[PDB]
Design a protein around this ligand. Structure first.
Ligand SMILES: O=P(O)(O)Oc1cc[n+]([C@@H]2O[C@H](COP(=O)(O)OP(=O)(O)OP(=O)(O)O)[C@@H](O)[C@H]2O)c(O)n1
Ligand SMILES: O=P(O)(O)Oc1cc[n+]([C@@H]2O[C@H](COP(=O)(O)OP(=O)(O)OP(=O)(O)O)[C@@H](O)[C@H]2O)c(O)n1
Ligand SMILES: O=P(O)(O)Oc1cc[n+]([C@@H]2O[C@H](COP(=O)(O)OP(=O)(O)OP(=O)(O)O)[C@@H](O)[C@H]2O)c(O)n1
Ligand SMILES: Nc1ncnc2c1ncn2[C@@H]1O[C@H](COP(=O)(O)OP(=O)(O)O)[C@@H](O)[C@H]1O
Ligand SMILES: Nc1ncnc2c1ncn2[C@@H]1O[C@H](COP(=O)(O)OP(=O)(O)O)[C@@H](O)[C@H]1O
Ligand SMILES: Nc1ncnc2c1ncn2[C@@H]1O[C@H](COP(=O)(O)OP(=O)(O)O)[C@@H](O)[C@H]1O
Ligand SMILES: [Mg+2]
Ligand SMILES: [Mg+2]
Ligand SMILES: [Mg+2]
Ligand SMILES: [Mg+2]
Ligand SMILES: [Mg+2]
Ligand SMILES: [Mg+2]
Lengths: 539, 539, 539
């Protein structure tokens, strides 16, 4: 029945071999999704081997965009997959890093809390990591105790930085025994075109490296570009001392939302459930089948330009792209993304050449960014051409700078991008970095309010520059409305043109793509995709 | 001739295998001695793998006593060997730790100094360590540039914590090339009594472990309890790909001062000089030959009790024992040390049984100590019996408490050892921890002044409790003189009885054993050993 | 009850760390003895990592003397411990070697039996080793199925040559599971005299090396020169993730026969029995208590000289020394062995200086031996002095050469030792190497027959030179009797002098020390020790 006896909290560790970017986090999220559908209270955590105390200092070329929690922690991208697939808000405790662990242990040492012992990588660092891992098992604020904790070990097996985390996982397996701890290992099977053969040797060496630290994998996720032959799975099972049930072929799916279907088809969830002896029920595919219908059988299609610097073949905008696809799903339209370099849009002819074929433009945020002249040039061209535009954070800032350059403020800029500008229409109110959720109030019957269908919202923020309040009345002559603000009205949070000036041009300082889920699309992307569809139909 | 052309600074790394306490630091110090006598400007450094930012938090049962520098840093015991053999004062920079390196790199990360890169154990931590190693090569404050830098890598090859230091050493060998970097490896040759054979396998495994991280030893120091046969040295040389000139048999010498002779006899210094291509001259053995005469051919002998808690077969008092032996050397007397437990001296009969055969008693300092009732009991017994006493730090505190209990203050104690005492004759003036060298003024013609033959001295301090100034006039009725003080007189630094009360009973808050050298004995220990000699002769 | 249900055959693997000669084989034999006394049918096996197909080609300086089985295989020394402690005869299958495994697999490859596969170290070599290991579990020729198979893995963990055998053991643990496979790891705890501390770090590194190949030890045998403190055992248990019940202190016992008492006192056998879930009964100590009474409480003492080349501090004569001690036990006399170099006995004065204080002389066999002039010189001196002499194999040959030089044959020798001798009294009958058991017939009422109390015996042989039948009638004039022969009389097997010529001087071509057991002493050593006792009493 739906009510089951109590059992100990199961730990499921996901580790990666050969390389990073194998979809280890996505596989963990998909397994969490399956286990949730089978009725278990899944909770998730990631361990990051890098020494940065948080990725805010990093550059999006390293690991993609940053993410933000409701308690306001700044975390890795994978927490975004966990949210999007579990449809949950996760604590800042869900992202441990070597930086945090070492700082914590050094601080404890300075206070003498180890009573004069020599502080060592074993036991003290591994003890701190094991404590942080087992803390996830404690009852939540409402007494709901997770049935499975899925922990993703970042990096690659054999990296110097992963040694403490894998040792902590080994000690957890020792403490809790094999009946409670399951190891999932993700590995790459490359295809060599010249000889036309899939090679299993990288997987064998990765599993040998994993065995060399005392971990035996329970199952293998063979990442590949094509479905692995059965003979190769048999060879891997034989060579690696892994149950032939546990070798799971995981070819590159056309979209990330097919991965749960691939894993269920291969019966990974059944294998995990049997091996951990969890109580279960069959997966109710109703919701995700509707989602996959919206994916694979859309009624129409629309092209959207994504304008940025990191667009040079990188997943620096993953959350934005997924929120775009969710918006398409709400309208049952396929959204095709045209990756447009910002610097080709600095000249009006270059902007026309890049954008002229698209049906909409998106200006995402960023940090350490440069060359926003191209972004604003794309805004100018798009407004003249009539394309809808959505500007996120820096997109809003570029919209406001465009409006400044529309009314008299030709040399206007952000103090970030021209510290000597005579018209700093964007300025520090380094100022307070706004992070996390803040409330905002919206103009009644604003386009933003028409989208959200409410006067009150909350959004995740990450920025420190603001619209300079000295220029509101000047730039309003552009026609721009400050259609949403902080509750006191002190801070501008949203801007838009009236529908008769342009059918849809909106910007927000927040990152609404971090509240979107594929089964709960965000209002603004639904609105933007609807406007793009209306443009395509009317054009 | 004495003047030679310029050459690059040579780096000599000393590493250990099989176990710690192999005399790796003493071997490094002896090699520094020999290279100094050959005329080279040797400087020395230690790398500590533990995460403690400094050993002040540790307990003397871990790695022996703590040491203190003139700039006031708190460092490992090995810096004491470096001082005692080079007769130099070393900067706090001479002791790096993993704690310091990680704290530094994490701090630099929080400040964004890596410009958005991912902070990694390689390159960033190894770069910080390599920077800290090469900083030793820079010209000193007077422009004197070291000819050789001898770096001791603490721990054992294969400890998880040593991995960054050995990688930094490997990178230094890569950067500077083999003509500048020399690796000396110290290893253990155990003797198995049942089969009567020395075993080389531990050495082979240690050298293989060292090779597995990219280091090839240039020489081997074979630590043993007996001289290694030549056949075994040949076997080791063959198996380890080491020049047969580089296998150095280093049996346990009767005293640490014979080690330079052992290494010279084996021509280790000649091998190092040839391999590094250093300019040299023959060793002038005059000074050290005189020292070894004072060591091995004394005119008389005296027995001194060392009373403490750590005395249970541990080198927690190494500096004190060596300062005692240096005092004996100044008088050409052998000082034999009887290691006496403090807790056997709590009862007067037990104190008599322990001490009755000795010619003097020494009360050294300590931290985390307990049971000073036994220490004070030993003081009481010794004073009644007429034995000379020297009290260091806690020894002075126990002397003052004994005097308190001599004049009316029977329940008197330190606030450290009885927080509820009605007479806290020792109290916090946690208060300011006095660390390092401080100046002091002495009573003219005091026994302390008679020893030092001056009215002004400076001594290294490590303590935070002080004599309570409220009780000076009360305890002076014991006959105790506050014969040395801070220049303002606010702090008591030395106490003594007049010679007619007891021929010599003196205590000092400082650690004079940290300024002693075997070739420059400290005045107070010369005085104490002279008093013990006078007792033995008169008794 | 004595009759128990059937259970699967348990595998107990014994492995060594740090070094060889740790008593790993003796510990395995003692555990086998305890388990036998608890009523289980123990069988034993050794795996030798070296490539020699059998140790016959080796030199006794490598691993001591060679051993011989009843089916005539030539095996390592440890098979001798297994026999002496189990009182059993073991098959030649009880000694696998890398040489045999590789030769077997290469031969199978040449015959195409792998059907075209690539022959690899994994699986094929490890499969052959695992097959040879599991073959021990098969029912014997009479259907008695062993309850525990104790396999000793030769070498040291981390040797290149041990990698296939430890991998085979790991695969056995995988196939049979943890309930059937138990790992015992023997490790060294060295004592460092200069700092007066036992060091556990070698054990930690050895266990880490063992874990790096996927083996977790169940118990640790800490070999040491002194009883390990309890705090160190606790530290080892904590650091190594080993049950605190499983750390077994095993100090160097005064005799090998005390080891079963040490292991039982530490409750190793109880730990093994509990962990393997074996059915058991209490150990009946009656027999071994009688043996230890004969060991520790003898009525008298006698000194015996052992004359050989390998006597320079090596266990090259272990079986002979143990048979000597068993002979002493039969008479309840302590036998003290004086290790005498052969080459000091070449001169009559040197022989007198070496032997004059002893009560008997033993001349053991050997191969690759030289300098038998010294051995024969010792025989000449001993005969003149009246000391009893026992000559084994080469001892008999030297006796016969002495007799040759007693009757006219001054230049007589073996063709082995002077190929140009004019009187080859010892000659090839390279000839047939006699190996293993052969029957012999004895002269009735010969001293040999008086000892054995029978006319028919069987003994283990290892030699290829024989007494030249052409010289029997010549050398009989010495007084020597060919008191035992092959059944056809063709081969001389024993020689003796009549009791009135010398009270006891006997030689045999065989190695009776390989049929001796401490609880079943061999007749000839009982006789020889009785003669030595009679000499001591009468002298
Ligand atoms: O992505 P996740 O989910 O696994 O999260 C991850 C992925 C990777 N890492 C670590 O960053 C460093 C470089 O990573 P990296 O794989 O990129 O190596 P590299 O030098 O850049 O070579 P490459 O060209 O292959 O990228 C390594 O120490 C990694 O262990 C962390 O902490 N979290
Ligand atoms: O002495 P130095 O000059 O080399 O300075 C030293 C000596 C040792 N260490 C480190 O402390 C830990 C335990 O040391 P440790 O040898 O004592 O092992 P253990 O567990 O206690 O076994 P054991 O019984 O043999 O002592 C290890 O991580 C070492 O790397 C450091 O940083 N500097
Ligand atoms: O005795 P067992 O029962 O373990 O049976 C043994 C002992 C040792 N071995 C192997 O012989 C080689 C040298 O042995 P070895 O320990 O003596 O090293 P080495 O070079 O001589 O240095 P060391 O001075 O310490 O002797 C190694 O390959 C060992 O793995 C074998 O096959 N059986
Ligand atoms: N099985 C897959 N099929 C298709 N695309 C994929 C798959 N797995 C991952 N991806 C994509 O590859 C990128 C990297 O995957 P990711 O989850 O982030 O691995 P990791 O966290 O270890 O770095 C993701 O943006 C994801 O969308
Ligand atoms: N070659 C030696 N002969 C005799 N005693 C020794 C020798 N080397 C070292 N010792 C002693 O053994 C102890 C260990 O030496 P130590 O300097 O601490 O080496 P490490 O840095 O590894 O800890 C010291 O107390 C030292 O006095
Ligand atoms: N625990 C012990 N106490 C005393 N003597 C011992 C002990 N163990 C072994 N020995 C002796 O040391 C020698 C080597 O032991 P051994 O069994 O042969 O180890 P291994 O086979 O691994 O080489 C043996 O001759 C044995 O008599
Ligand atoms: Mg990634
Ligand atoms: Mg990368
Ligand atoms: Mg040390
Ligand atoms: Mg230690
Ligand atoms: Mg052996
Ligand atoms: Mg050997």
């Amino acid at each position: 029945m739906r009510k089951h006896p109590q059992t100990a909290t199961k730990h499921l560790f996901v580790s990666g071999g050969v390389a990073s970017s194998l979809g280890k986090g996505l596989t963990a999220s998909s397994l969490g999704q399956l286990l949730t559908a089978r009725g278990l209270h899944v909770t998730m955590q990631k361990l990051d081997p890098y020494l940065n105390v948080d990725p805010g200092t990093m550059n999006p070329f390293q690991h993609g965009e940053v993410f933000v929690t409701e308690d306001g922690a700044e975390t890795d991208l994978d927490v975004g997959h966990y949210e999007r697939f579990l449809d949950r808000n996760l604590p800042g405790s869900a992202n441990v890093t070597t930086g945090q662990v070492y700082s914590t242990v050094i601080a404890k040492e300075r206070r003498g809390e180890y009573l004069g012992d020599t502080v060592q990588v074993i036991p003290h660092i591994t003890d701190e990591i094991k404590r942080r891992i087992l803390a996830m098992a404690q009852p939540d604020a409402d007494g709901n105790r997770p049935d499975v904790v899925i922990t993703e070990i970042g990096g690659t097996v054999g990296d110097i930085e992963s040694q403490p985390f894998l040792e902590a996982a080994r000690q957890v397996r020792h403490y809790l025994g094999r009946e409670d701890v399951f190891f999932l290992h993700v590995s790459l099977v490359p295809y060599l075109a010249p000889s036309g053969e899939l090679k299993t040797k990288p997987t064998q060496h990765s599993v040998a490296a994993l065995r060399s630290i005392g971990i035996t994998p329970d199952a293998l996720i063979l990442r590949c570009d094509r479905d692995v032959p059965e003979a190769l799975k048999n060879k891997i099972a034989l060579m690696c001392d892994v149950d032939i049930d546990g070798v799971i072929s995981t070819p590159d799916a056309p979209s990330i939302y097919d991965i749960p279907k691939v894993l269920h088809r291969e019966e990974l969830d059944a294998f995990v459930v049997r091996r951990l002896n969890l109580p279960f029920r069959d997966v109710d595919w109703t919701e995700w089948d509707d989602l996959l219908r919206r994916v694979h059988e859309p009624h129409e299609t629309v092209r959207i330009a994504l304008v940025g610097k990191y667009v040079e073949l990188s997943d620096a905008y993953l959350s934005v792209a997924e929120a775009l696809r969710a918006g398409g799903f709400k309208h049952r339209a396929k959204v095709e993304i045209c990756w447009v370099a910002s610097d080709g849009c600095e000249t009006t002819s270059g902007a026309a050449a890049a954008l002229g074929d698209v049906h909409g433009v998106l200006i995402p945020g960023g940090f350490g960014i440069r060359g926003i002249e191209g972004k604003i040039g794309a805004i100018a061209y798009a407004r003249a051409r009539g394309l809808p535009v959505l500007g996120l954070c820096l997109g809003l800032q570029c919209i406001v700078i465009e409006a400044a350059r529309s009314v008299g403020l030709t040399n206007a800029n952000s103090a970030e991008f021209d510290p000597d500008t005579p018209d700093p229409v964007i300025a520090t109110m380094g100022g307070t970095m706004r992070l996390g959720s803040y409330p905002a109030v919206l103009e009644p019957d604003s386009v933003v309010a028409q989208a959200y269908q409410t006067t009150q919202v909350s959004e995740r923020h990450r920025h420190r520059y603001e619209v300079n309040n000295a220029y509101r009345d000047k730039i309003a002559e552009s026609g721009l409305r400050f259609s949403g603000t902080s509750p006191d009205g002190h801070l501008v949070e949203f801007v838009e043109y009236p529908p008769d000036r342009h059918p849809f041009v909106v910007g927000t300082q927040a990152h609404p793509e971090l509240k979107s889920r594929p089964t709960r699309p965000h209002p603004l992307f639904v609105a933007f995709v609807g406007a793009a569809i209306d443009y395509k139909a009317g054009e």
